[PDB]
């Protein structure tokens, strides 16, 4: 299957600091429809996983413009402006582009 | 509105049942998943049923073991599970992805349910 892989594991951050996590993917995951199925989800602790970014760029109701997507083909990358309590948790990316469906480990962030 | 519920320590061959209670929405358009997390924190999709039920997709490594059903007895999502190995343990969520618009896959989850093959 595509391998979903996250850097780094665990990041610590100080209230309003600036951030990147990076997920890299076994696979190409421009789907044959020109679209790229890469997706991001936040779970805060004790939570459930919730969606934060689809298809790479876009937000999803409710989330903050602090959360920005990018990447293409292998390489993505989420970017947090200024991290709030409320950001920690770990963030997951996920491929939907190819079958079997696959995530990554997740990335903690965690207050330093 | 996602619980889910029926799971347990159970033995490695074992069989098991989970099912997911739905509420708040309209269901039958509602694209209907499980997922489960490891220990370790990862994420593995286990399968999708569409609204409807016309379609399922489950991962290689379920296939045949396990059973996924959007039945009806109110609204439920349903997941029977057999030979159970324990590399099946982890927390068990149901998710939903709305059919009209294009996000994400799973883009609600539940509270999750635990199951725990052991001993």
């Known amino acids: 299957d595509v391998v979903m892989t996250q850097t780094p594991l665990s990041l610590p951050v100080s209230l309003g600091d600036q951030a990147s996590i990076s997920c890299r993917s076994s696979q190409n995951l421009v789907h044959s429809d020109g679209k790229t199925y890469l997706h991001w989800f936040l779970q805060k602790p004790g939570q459930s996983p919730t969606l934060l970014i689809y298809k790479v760029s876009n937000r999803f109701s409710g989330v903050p413009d602090r959360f920005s997507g990018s990447g293409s083909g292998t390489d993505f990358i989420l970017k947090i402006s200024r991290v709030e309590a409320e950001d920690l948790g770990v963030y997951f990316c996920?491929?939907?582009?190819?079958?079997?469906?696959?995530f990554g480990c997740g990335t903690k962030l965690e207050l330093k | 509105q996602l619980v889910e519920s029926g799971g347990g320590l159970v033995k490695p061959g074992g069989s098991l049942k989970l099912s997911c209670a739905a509420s708040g929405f309209i269901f039958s358009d509602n694209y209907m998943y499980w997922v489960r997390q490891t220990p370790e924190k990862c994420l593995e999709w286990v399968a999708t049923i569409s609204d409807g039920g016309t379609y399922i997709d489950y991962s290689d490594s379920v296939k045949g073991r396990f059973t996924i059903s959007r039945d009806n007895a109110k609204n439920n999502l349903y997941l029977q599970m057999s030979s159970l190995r324990s590399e099946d343990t982890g927390m068990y969520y149901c998710?939903?992805?709305?059919?009209?618009?294009?996000?994400?896959?799973?883009?609600?989850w539940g509270q999750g349910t635990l199951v725990t093959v052991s001993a």
């Open positions: 998710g939903r992805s709305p059919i009209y618009y294009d996000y994400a896959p799973f883009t609600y």
């Open positions: 996920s491929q939907s582009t190819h079958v079997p469906l696959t």
